[PDB]
């Protein structure tokens, strides 16, 4: 019973291992194993639950263990090990074959098979930890191991794609430990985590790995927003080390999401409004990306309201996620009509929901945008309007108060009007008739290069596959 369960999963694990084993040996095929490793994460997670945990026990006995003897026992110690044929050396699948890692040449240390075996061993360990939700001592123990091992080994172009997915598990397992319980050991542990990211980033820049730098930057930018340090994030994004070529669309959408929140508090929403749009377009529409689409859609509505523009209501209607968008719908109506009591009562009841995503601090700026938008509505519809006519609509304080609020928006060119104190009425200074001016021409010259932007990123991609197509023999 238990014997047939251990040999079935290990045969499938070696079958998937031998595929990427022969591809990295000859020249550089590394683009091919990258596609296999995408499905390896999903195929291993479903396989971990079946055949209990014993698939990883016999796999270590098969190959040679540099560090991995005590790590399995320590992993099996927390679960109250049940020992069945647990003596090392019970299952031997090698039997002296070249693809089986021939034992005599391996045990005599005349050849080194550890490079591809050890780096692949750490990948399967991190998968069971996140699947079984094992925390506390097992999180810190594995962090003290993998990090020193990566500094000793020299990662080639193919080897840099191994640990690239291991950096995600180091940061994820640490954040789940901090949110579960807070202590003095959690703050000091994050200090080393921030120090290790800066040392390996320089090494990854020399190898010019696209997936490695894409995974690091996404994890590094998130740490900056947790501590709230702009000076660290501002200088980091100025280098532009993030390759846009071979990175996946899921890694791109996460990159544009960070830039929207950085420029939001910098009071420049012109560039931030495009970053939140690019994050949605690059993110897939499937169910696994709903976690990113839920947060990105909530940030888009916050960016618009801070610009003075009001987003469309169909976004809160035709979508299927509107159940979570209900708190942001009441903020849409309160800004339009300019009601002061409606905005104060809206953020009071939903304050509990706004604390989770930390968007309640951005709602403080919305208190000013309620009046700024109401002035824009009445100024565009009414060209020449008196001074006291505004205070009778929005129920403002006095005539001197509204005079200062109108002169505030003309700084950035929002209202585009003038205040005449002698005559005592505000007149709109926009006569339109800009068709004869050169202002539309500035956008025209930019849209000429926008069409050519997709031209240089495309024609190259046609010949990209054609090499291996024409090199293979055709019938």
């Amino acid at each position: 019973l238990h014997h047939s369960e251990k040999k079935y999963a290990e045969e499938d694990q070696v079958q998937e291992l031998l595929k990427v084993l022969n591809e990295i040996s000859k020249t550089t095929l590394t683009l091919d194993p990258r596609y296999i490793w995408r499905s390896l994460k999903d195929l291993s997670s479903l396989r971990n639950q079946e055949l209990l945990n014993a698939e990883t026990l016999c796999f270590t006995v098969n190959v040679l263990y540099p560090d991995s003897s005590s790590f399995k026992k320590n992993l099996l110690k927390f679960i109250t090990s049940n020992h069945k044929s647990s003596v090392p050396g019970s299952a031997e699948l090698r039997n002296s074959y070249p693809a089986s890692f021939y034992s005599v040449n391996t045990e005599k240390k005349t050849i080194e098979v550890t490079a591809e075996i050890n780096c692949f061993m750490h990948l399967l360990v991190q998968l069971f930890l996140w699947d079984s939700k094992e925390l506390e001592q097992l999180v810190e123990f594995n962090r003290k191991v993998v990090i020193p091992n990566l500094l000793c080994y020299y990662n080639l172009r193919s080897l840099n794609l191994i640990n690239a997915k291991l950096w995600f598990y180091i940061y994820l397992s640490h954040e789940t430990l901090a949110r579960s319980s807070e202590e003095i050991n959690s703050d000091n542990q994050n200090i080393i985590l921030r120090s290790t990211m800066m040392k390996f980033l320089k090494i990854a820049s020399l190898k010019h790995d696209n997936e490695t730098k894409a995974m690091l930057i996404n994890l590094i930018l998130r740490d900056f927003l947790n501590n709230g340090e702009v000076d660290s994030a501002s200088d980091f994004i100025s280098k532009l080390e993030y390759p846009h070529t071979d990175v996946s669309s899921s890694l791109e959408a996460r990159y544009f999401f960070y830039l929207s929140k950085i420029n939001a508090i910098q009071l420049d929403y012109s560039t931030a409004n495009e970053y939140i749009i690019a994050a949605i377009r690059k993110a897939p529409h499937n169910s696994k990306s709903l976690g990113f689409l839920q947060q990105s859609n909530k940030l888009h509505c916050c960016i618009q309201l801070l610009m003075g523009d009001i987003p469309e209501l169909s976004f809160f209607h035709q979508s299927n996620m509107q159940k979570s968008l209900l708190p942001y719908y009441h903020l849409t109506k309160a800004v339009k009509l300019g009601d002061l009591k409606k905005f104060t009562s809206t953020i009071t009841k939903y304050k509990q929901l706004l604390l989770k995503d930390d968007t309640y601090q951005l709602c403080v700026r919305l208190r000013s945008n309620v009046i700024k938008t109401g002035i824009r509505i009445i100024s565009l519809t009414y060209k020449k309007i008196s001074l006291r006519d505004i205070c009778l609509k929005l129920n403002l304080d006095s005539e001197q108060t509204v005079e200062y609020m109108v002169s505030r928006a003309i700084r950035d060119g929002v209202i585009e009007a003038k205040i005449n104190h002698e005559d005592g009425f505000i007149e709109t200074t926009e006569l339109l008739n800009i068709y004869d001016s050169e202002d539309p021409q500035q956008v025209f010259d930019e849209r000429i290069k926008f069409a050519n932007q997709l031209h240089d990123e495309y024609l190259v991609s046609m010949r990209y596959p054609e090499d291996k197509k024409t090199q293979q023999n055709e019938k």
Binding site: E183, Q266, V364, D445, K449, N452, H455
Partner: protein, 272 residues
């Protein structure tokens, strides 16, 4: 003004007796003994020393040290004590005795940023605070920098002037940054009617910037270079030019044609 052998008690006694210039003379010997034992700044590792040795009395050294530099109107020193207090009120978990102790000392740095019209560092420290819903909003103290940012963005300058006057906390700690930031309020409201609004009035602008005397109004016009005519004051500076060199931006002349001509040679260079 040294008093006892301990540099902490000698600084506290000289703090209440005045002469803040002599209090900085004892600053160099403070860092001499602390850095050797690494007691000046909390170490990121675990030295088994948190509330012991001089780490308990060091928080009181830089507390009155920042209060000494704010009275001397030193912006270079005030930013130094704040960065030295950055690791403090952070480590030692969430609890020592009073935890953050006085929370208005940190807000002094937030209030000084609004006088320089810097929104980058002002809103950056809002997320740096541990309690967003307690020591920031629910806290009745430190309300000058936070609430003023709401009234300035709202556009009401009448209630913004009452925060620096009607408040009871501006007597001692916030007194130094009151009149300094008051000059920043009048400079911002004056620029609202300056660039866009063309012909400036006489008696009205006195009430916008809160001027008590009419002669103070003319003194502000000489520093801002306002053209003066008979019984009126105009503004001729609406047009902007020069400002170092600008290429391919803001209404070029000869280079504007080359921008369109470059787009034609762009597609040709790709085929090349």
């Amino acid at each position: 003004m040294p008093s006892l052998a301990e540099l902490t008690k000698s600084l506290s006694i000289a703090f209440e007796n005045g002469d803040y210039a002599a209090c900085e003379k004892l600053l160099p010997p403070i860092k001499i003994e602390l850095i050797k034992n690494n007691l000046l700044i909390p170490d990121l590792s675990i030295q088994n020393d948190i509330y012991l040795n001089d780490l308990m009395i060091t928080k009181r050294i830089l507390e009155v040290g920042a209060l000494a530099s704010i009275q001397t109107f030193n912006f270079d020193s005030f930013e130094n004590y704040f960065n030295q207090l950055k690791p403090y009120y952070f480590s030692n978990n969430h609890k020592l005795s009073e935890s953050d102790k006085k929370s208005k000392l940190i807000s002094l740095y937030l209030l000084n940023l609004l006088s320089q019209n810097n929104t980058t560092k002002f809103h950056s420290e809002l997320q740096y605070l541990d309690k967003h819903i307690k020591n920031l909003e629910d806290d009745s103290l430190l309300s000058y920098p936070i609430k003023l940012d709401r009234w300035l963005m709202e556009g009401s300058y009448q209630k913004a002037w009452d925060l620096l006057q009607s408040g009871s906390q501006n007597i001692s700690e916030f007194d130094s940054f009151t009149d300094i930031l008051k000059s920043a309020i009048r400079d911002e409201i004056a620029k609202n009617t300056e660039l866009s609004y063309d012909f400036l009035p006489l008696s009205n602008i006195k009430a916008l910037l809160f001027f008590n005397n009419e002669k103070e109004t003319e003194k502000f016009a000489l520093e801002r270079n306002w053209p003066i005519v008979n019984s009126k004051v105009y503004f001729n500076n609406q047009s902007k030019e020069k400002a170092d060199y600008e290429d391919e931006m803001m209404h070029e002349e000869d280079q504007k044609t080359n921008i369109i001509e470059k787009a034609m040679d762009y597609a040709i260079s790709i085929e090349n």
